[PDB]
Design a protein around this nucleic acid. Structure first.
Lengths: 71, 83, 25, 132, 98, 217, 129, 221
RNA sequence: AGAUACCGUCGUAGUUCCGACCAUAAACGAUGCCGACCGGCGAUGCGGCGGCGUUAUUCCCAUGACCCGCCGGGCAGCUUCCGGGAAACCAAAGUCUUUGGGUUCCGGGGGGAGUAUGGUUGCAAAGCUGAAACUUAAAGGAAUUGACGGAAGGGCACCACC
C-alpha cells in the first residue's frame, strides 16, 4: 500500500477494485465477453452432432496426425 | 538460558562485544579477545592478572576498534585521563 | 520489422480503415 | 635457446641450501659431488643442474640468492647483530624544532628544554600541487 | 545494461548541449559527447624544416604552428583509432596518457 | 600508562621524538587522526601530539606482554624503511619477523609450509603491509599497527600514531616499542638508559654502505 | 514534511543502533517521544536520556547500548481492542517472551502487557525489541 | 586412520585437553580440520545429500560437465551445517562436500515459545536468512507441530533437532542452491540475535591459545 | 544482379522570421515529489564568515586577483563489507520477513495492440481514453563460459613473408 492513512479505505478498496481488472483470470470470470465466446457457454460438457472428420497435423517436433472430429 | 525450572537449558552462552554490546557469532572469525597486561604502580612490569576487551568483526572493518579500545582503556584505569 | 516502421504501417492502414468508413456519410 | 627447467633450477636450489660446504666456484669440483648428493638416471640432466649450481655459487659471493636461507644468511644478520655506529641523530644539542610545536610541548611538562634550538614560522604558505 | 555511469558524454545538469559537427564525417554529435582533440603542430614537420632555414631571409625565424581543434563523432574517432575499446575497469580512467 | 609517574613521558624521550621527525606528519588527514593530532602547521604538515604518540605505545607494549608466548607475536614490514627495524625486534623480544614479502595466504592456507597460526600481529604501514590485515581479519588475530596521519585505522585494534614514512623516524618508533616490551617482561630498569642504540634498528641504505669505507678513511 | 514525530525521531535512533553509535541526537522532542523512550528505559533496552530545552520544540540525546535490536513505529494510529491485541503481538513481535508493542491507552502510554493487566486498549504507537 | 593434526586449534583436540567444541563456538575460532567434527559430534552424526546438480562450462569443442553435492549434516541435538563442493564425478563431490559441511557446522539456539517450561523444542525468535533472492523465515511454533515446510528446509531443521517451527520461503526457491543456504543462514543467525536472556554481561574467559600455551610450545617448534 | 539505397551532382517542401495550431521524443538520470536519518575525501559553483603574506589603483585604506580553512545550498566526482540487489551497480536503488513517515501516478506471462470500437480535441496529420475474440510455453533481465566478427591490440612460423 503506497497510501497507508487512517481514513484511506475509499482509495485502498477503489484502487484494488480498478487494478483487479488487470488480473487476466479475474477479468475473464467477470466480463460478458469471455463467457459468451466459450463454445460450451459455462458448461462442463456438451453433446454435438459430428458433421465431418479432420486429420489435424501434430504441432511441432512430433510429426504425427492427431485424427480429430469437427462437431 | 533459564527454563521455568531455572537450570541452563542451552549448550553454550556466547560472547558479547565489549565496545558495542552486539553479540559475537560462532563463526565471526574477525573477532578479537585482546588481553592487556597489568602493570604495578612502582615496578612497571607484568603481574599475572590480565585486562581483557573483545570487539566483533563488524567494528574492525568499520575502523572504530582503536577508537573503542582507546575508550575501553581511557576510563577503565590503563591510559591517561588527559591523554 | 522495426517497432518504428511497424507503428508507421499501422498508421498508413488506420488512414485507410478511416477512408473505408468515410464513404458511408 | 638454453633456459633452465624446474627439474634443473629447483633441483640446484635444494642442493645449495643443504650443501653450501661440498660445492664451490669451479664446475668440475661440484659436477662430481652430484654423483653423491643426487641419484640421477641421466648424464645430461646432471650437467644442466651442476652447471646452474656454479652460476648461483657466484651469487652467494656477490649478494644473496632468491630461493636460499642458509647459516651464512643467519651469519649475515649475526655480523650486524650489534652494529653500533658513531653518535647518531639522537645525540644532537642544536635540533630544528617547528615553532608551532613549541605550543604542544608547553601544555605538557616540557615548557622549555636544554638541548633544543627554536626557528621562526614560514609566511607565504604555498605547499599544494597545482590542480591538473 | 547501463555500460557507462555518465551516458557516454559529460553533461550532468543541462539536458541539452548544442551539437558541433564531426570532421571525418559530418555527424551531428553533441559538444560534450564528441571526442575533442586540439592539435598544436609545426606547418612543416621535421624533414622540410632542415631546408627552409637556409631560404629564410631573416635571422633564425622560428616557424608558425598550425592550430586545429578536431571534433570527432564516435564512429569516426574509432575508425581513425583516436580512441579505443578498454577493459571493464580500464574504461573509467579519465587520465590522458602522454 | 594512566596517571602513573613511572610510565610518564621521560625527559630523554621527547628529544628523540623531535630529532627523529615523528611530529613531522603528512599533508592529507584521515578523519580518525584528529584524535591523535594537536594542530595543523604552516606548509600543510600535521603535528602528531607526542603524548598521544607515547600513551598508545605503552598499551601496545602491555598487549605484546599480555601474550604469554613471545614467539607467536608476528611483526611485519614489507616497505624497506622498517624491514631491519622489525628484524632487530625479533631476536631481542623473542618474536617472529616478516622483513619483506608476506606470502598472501599464510594464516588461512594450512598446507603452505610457512603456516604461521599467530596470536597477535604488529604492522609497520597499514597501506603497504595491508595483506596480513585481511588474513588477520579471517582468523581470530588481533592487529597492532605503527599508524600515520595518512594511513587508515582500518582492521587495526590498537594504533601507534607515528611518522612511519621517514627513514630514521621508523626504527626509533620500533626501538621505543622494543624497549617497553623488554622493560615490562623484566630485562631493563627505568633508572638507566638501555645499552642497545636506536640507530642499530635504522635500515642502512645500500647507497650509504658504499660510503662509510671513505667517510672515516 | 515531517508528518509523524514518533516515526522520524525513532527512525533516527535505529540508524545509531545498526551503526553502533553510543548516543544519538533525535531532533523533535514531543510528549509522545519521552513517554515512548521511558517505556524503553523502564523496560531497560536503552540507557537514560535528557531533553534539551530551547524556546522551540526541544531536542533529545539518548544514551544507547547495543541491547536494542529494532525500534519499529506503526503509522497511522490504528485502534486496538484486547482480543485484536493478540494478533498485533503475533505478526509484529519476534517471540512471545520478549519484545513489547507500546500503545496509547486512555490510562496513559504503556506497553501491551500493562494494557493487558489494566484491561484497556487504545490507538497503537509502535513496537521495540 | 590417525589424523596427525596441522592447526593449533586442532592440535589440542586429539590429546583430549580441550573438553569439547563448545569453547570453539565461544571464541569463534575456525574449525579448518575435518576430524574435529568426527571426534566430538561425529558420534550421533547423520549425513544426507539433498541435490546432485551437474554444471556445464562451454569449452572450445564439447562441454566439461562437473557434478555438485549439496550435503546437509547434523547430530539431532543442536548442530547442523551446509557443504557445497563441485567435482567432475559423483563419488568425489559427495565424499568431498561432507568435509566442507563439517568445516561449517554451526550451533542452533533452540528454546521455548509461550510458557518456558519442559524441554527445549523450537527456535526462540523470528530469525531470517536470505542468499540469492530466496528468503526463508523461521518462526517459533506451539509444541508437537512438526516442521511445516518444504521437503528440503524441513530436512535440515529435522537434522538440527528443531522440532517446532513455522517456515515462510519467499523468492525463487526453485534453485536448491540458494534454498538450502538461506534456511541454513536463519539457523546460523539464532546465536547472532541479542535476546534479553543474554544480558548477564559476558566476562572474557581465557582463550585456549592462552590457557594451553605451554602445551603449544613443547609439542612442536 | 538489382538497388525509387549507402557515394556524387542539382533540387521541391522544409530550414528563417512574424501570427496561430499541434501536444508528441531514448521529453532518459529509462530512477515522481516534500521530510528525516545513516561513511569518508579531493574538487568545484554561488553567497556569507574567519585567517599570515603576495601582487593591483600606492597616496594608506576600503576592496578585488590569489591564499589557508569554515559554513550554507546546488552540479557531479572519488573511495568503502554502512547497507542493499537477480546481478550489473547505487550515500541511494540504503535504513524492507526485524515488513507501516506522508502522498500522487502506475505494473500484473508473451503476443493480439496502443489494434477494434464508442467518446473527445484537431484545418488535417493525429492525440488522450481503450478492449475483446483468438493465440502461445515462453518473451525477458543481469551475468558466466565458449564459438564467432569484414572489432582493437600482442605474438609464432620458410606447411607465412622478406
Amino acid at each position: 500500500g503506497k497510501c497507508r492513512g487512517l481514513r484511506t479505505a475509499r482509495k485502498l478498496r477503489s484502487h484494488r477494485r480498478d487494478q483487479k481488472w488487470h488480473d487476466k483470470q479475474y477479468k475473464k470470470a467477470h466480463l460478458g465477453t469471455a463467457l459468451k465466446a466459450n463454445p460450451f457457454g459455462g458448461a462442463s460438457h456438451a453433446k454435438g452432432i459430428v458433421l465431418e472428420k479432420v486429420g489435424v497435423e501434430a504441432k511441432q517436433p512430433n510429426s504425427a496426425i492427431r485424427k480429430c472430429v469437427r462437431v | 538460558m533459564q527454563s521455568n525450572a531455572g537450570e541452563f537449558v542451552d549448550l553454550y552462552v556466547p560472547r558479547k562485544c565489549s565496545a558495542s554490546n552486539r553479540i559475537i557469532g560462532a563463526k565471526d572469525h574477525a573477532s578479537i579477545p585482546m588481553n592487556v597486561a597489568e602493570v604495578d604502580k612502582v615496578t612497571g612490569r607484568f603481574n599475572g592478572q590480565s585486562k581483557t576487551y573483545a570487539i566483533c568483526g563488524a567494528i574492525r572493518r568499520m575502523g572504530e576498534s582503536d577508537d573503542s579500545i582507546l575508550r575501553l582503556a581511557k576510563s577503565h584505569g590503563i591510559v591517561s585521563q588527559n591523554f | 520489422m522495426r517497432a518504428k516502421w511497424r507503428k508507421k504501417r499501422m498508421r498508413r492502414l488506420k488512414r485507410k480503415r478511416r477512408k473505408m468508413r468515410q464513404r458511408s456519410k | 635457446g638454453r633456459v633452465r627447467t624446474k627439474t634443473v633450477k629447483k633441483a640446484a636450489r635444494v642442493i645449495i641450501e643443504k650443501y653450501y660446504t661440498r660445492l664451490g666456484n669451479d664446475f668440475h669440483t661440484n659436477k662430481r659431488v652430484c654423483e653423491e648428493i643426487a641419484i640421477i638416471p641421466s648424464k645430461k640432466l646432471r650437467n644442466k643442474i651442476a652447471g646452474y649450481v656454479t652460476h648461483l655459487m657466484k651469487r652467494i659471493q656477490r649478494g644473496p640468492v632468491r630461493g636460499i636461507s642458509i647459516k651464512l644468511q643467519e651469519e649475515e644478520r649475526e655480523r650486524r647483530d650489534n652494529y653500533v655506529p658513531e653518535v647518531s641523530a639522537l645525540d644532537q644539542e642544536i635540533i630544528e624544532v617547528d615553532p608551532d610545536t613549541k605550543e604542544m610541548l608547553k601544555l605538557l611538562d616540557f615548557g622549555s628544554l636544554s638541548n633544543l634550538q627554536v626557528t621562526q614560522p614560514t609566511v607565504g604558505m604555498n605547499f599544494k600541487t597545482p590542480r591538473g | 545494461t547501463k555500460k557507462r555511469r555518465n551516458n557516454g558524454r559529460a553533461k550532468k545538469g543541462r539536458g541539452h548541449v548544442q551539437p558541433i559537427r564531426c570532421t571525418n564525417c559530418a555527424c551531428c554529435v553533441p559538444k560534450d559527447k564528441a571526442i575533442k582533440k586540439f592539435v598544436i603542430r609545426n606547418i612543416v614537420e621535421a624533414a622540410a624544416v632542415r631546408d627552409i632555414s637556409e631560404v629564410s631571409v631573416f635571422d633564425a625565424y622560428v616557424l608558425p604552428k598550425l592550430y586545429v581543434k578536431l571534433h570527432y563523432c564516435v564512429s569516426c574517432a574509432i575508425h581513425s583509432k583516436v580512441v579505443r575499446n578498454r577493459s571493464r575497469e580500464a574504461r573509467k580512467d579519465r587520465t590522458p596518457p602522454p | 600508562s594512566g596517571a602513573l609517574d613511572v610510565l610518564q613521558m621521560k625527559e630523554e624521550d621527547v628529544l628523540k621524538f623531535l630529532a627523529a621527525g615523528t611530529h613531522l606528519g603528512g599533508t592529507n588527514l584521515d578523519f580518525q587522526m584528529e584524535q591523535y593530532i594537536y594542530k595543523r602547521k604552516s606548509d600543510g604538515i600535521y603535528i602528531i601530539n607526542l603524548k598521544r604518540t607515547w600513551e598508545k605505545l605503552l598499551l601496545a607494549a602491555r598487549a605484546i606482554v599480555a601474550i604469554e608466548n613471545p614467539a607467536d607475536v608476528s611483526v611485519i614490514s614489507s616497505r624497506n624503511t622498517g624491514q631491519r627495524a622489525v628484524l632487530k625486534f625479533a631476536a631481542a623480544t623473542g618474536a617472529t619477523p616478516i622483513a619483506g614479502r608476506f606470502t598472501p595466504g599464510t594464516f588461512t592456507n594450512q598446507i603452505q609450509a610457512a603456516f604461521r597460526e599467530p596470536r597477535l600481529l604488529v604492522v609497520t604501514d597499514p597501506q603497504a603491509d595491508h595483506q596480513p590485515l585481511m588474513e588477520a581479519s579471517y582468523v581470530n588475530l588481533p592487529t597492532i599497527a605503527l599508524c600515520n596521519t595518512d594511513s587508515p585505522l582500518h582492521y587495526v585494534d590498537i594504533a601507534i600514531p607515528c611518522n612511519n614514512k621517514g627513514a630514521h623516524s621508523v626504527g626509533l618508533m620500533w626501538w621505543m616499542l622494543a624497549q617497553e616490551v623488554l622493560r615490562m617482561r623484566g630485562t631493563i630498569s627505568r633508572e638507566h638508559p638501555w645499552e642497545v642504540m636506536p640507530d642499530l634498528y635504522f635500515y642502512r641504505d645500500p647507497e650509504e654502505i658504499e660510503k662509510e669505507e671513505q667517510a672515516a678513511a | 514534511v515531517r508528518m509523524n514525530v514518533l516515526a522520524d525521531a525513532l527512525k533516527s535512533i535505529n540508524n545509531a543502533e545498526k551503526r553502533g553509535k553510543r548516543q544519538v541526537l533525535i531532533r523533535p522532542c514531543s510528549k509522545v517521544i519521552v513517554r515512548f523512550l521511558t517505556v524503553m528505559m523502564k523496560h531497560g533496552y536503552i540507557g537514560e536520556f535528557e531533553i534539551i530545552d530551547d524556546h522551540r520544540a526541544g531536542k533529545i540525546v539518548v544514551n544507547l547500548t547495543g541491547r536494542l535490536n529494532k525500534c519499529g513505529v506503526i503509522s497511522p494510529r490504528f485502534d486496538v481492542q484486547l482480543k485484536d491485541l493478540e494478533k498485533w503481538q503475533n505478526n509484529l513481535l519476534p517471540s512471545r517472551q520478549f519484545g513489547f508493542i507500546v500503545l496509547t491507552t486512555s490510562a496513559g502510554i504503556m506497553d501491551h502487557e500493562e494494557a493487558r493487566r489494566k484491561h484497556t486498549g487504545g490507538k497503537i504507537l509502535g513496537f521495540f525489541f | 586412520k590417525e589424523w596427525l593434526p596441522v592447526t593449533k586449534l586442532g592440535r589440542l583436540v586429539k590429546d583430549m585437553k580441550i573438553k569439547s567444541l563448545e569453547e570453539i563456538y565461544l571464541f569463534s575460532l575456525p574449525i579448518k580440520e575435518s576430524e574435529i567434527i568426527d571426534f566430538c559430534l561425529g558420534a550421533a552424526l547423520k549425513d544426507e545429500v539433498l541435490k546432485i546438480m551437474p554444471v556445464q562450462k562451454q569449452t572450445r569443442a564439447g562441454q566439461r560437465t562437473r557434478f555438485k553435492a549439496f550435503v546437509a549434516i547434523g547430530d539431532y541435538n543442536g548442530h547442523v551445517g551446509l557443504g557445497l563442493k563441485c567435482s567432475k564425478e559423483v563419488a568425489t563431490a559427495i565424499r568431498g562436500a561432507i568435509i566442507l559441511a563439517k568445516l561449517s557446522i554451526v550451533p542452533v539456539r533452540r528454546g521455548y515459545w509461550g510458557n518456558k517450561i519442559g524441554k527445549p523444542h523450537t527456535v526462540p525468535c523470528k530469525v531470517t536468512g536470505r542468499c540469492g533472492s530466496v528468503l526463508v523465515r523461521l518462526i517459533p511454533a506451539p509444541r508437537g507441530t512438526g516442521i511445516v515446510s518444504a521437503p528440503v528446509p524441513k530436512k535440515l531443521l529435522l537434522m538440527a533437532g528443531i522440532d517446532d517451527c513455522y517456515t515462510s520461503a519467499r523468492g525463487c526457491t526453485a534453485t536448491l542452491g540458494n534454498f538450502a543456504k538461506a534456511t541454513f543462514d536463519a539457523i546460523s543467525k539464532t546465536y547472532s540475535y541479542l535476546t534479553p536472556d543474554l544480558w548477564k554481561e559476558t566476562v572474557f574467559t581465557k582463550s585456549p591459545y592462552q590457557e594451553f600455551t605451554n602445551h603449544l610450545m613443547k609439542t612442536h617448534t
